[PDB]
């Protein structure tokens, strides 16, 4: 201010910004065979937990 004589004036204010993009879309997709579901030794529920854990 002391170098401008003793003058002042208003500047225009400004912004900056960044974009968050919701651009990731990922999937799980698998078959459980009805014959295998009958013929195996126990539950196949673990494949659903495995797919959820993978996502």
């Amino acid at each position: 201010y002391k170098a401008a004589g003793r003058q002042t004036s208003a500047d225009a204010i400004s912004d900056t910004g960044v974009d968050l993009l919701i651009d990731q879309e990922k999937s799980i997709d698998f078959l459980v065979d009805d014959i295998d579901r009958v013929q195996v030794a126990g539950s196949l529920e673990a494949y659903t937990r495995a797919g959820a854990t993978a996502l």
Partner: protein
């Protein structure tokens, strides 16, 4: 100026199409819909009048 903090607004309603009012299906004959509950053809027949002879 503010290049990033000024929003844009979206209307939450879609504009509908302006579409012609349909009228013809109520003006024409519908009587064959009972018989045409089956099949892919209706045969409709008319008289041929006998000729007046001199």
């Amino acid at each position: 100026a503010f290049n990033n903090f000024i929003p844009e607004l979206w209307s939450d309603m879609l504009l509908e199409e302006w579409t012609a009012q349909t009228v013809f299906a109520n003006l024409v004959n519908r009587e064959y819909e009972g018989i045409a509950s089956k099949g892919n053809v209706v045969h409709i027949a008319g008289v041929v009048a006998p000729t007046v002879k001199d």
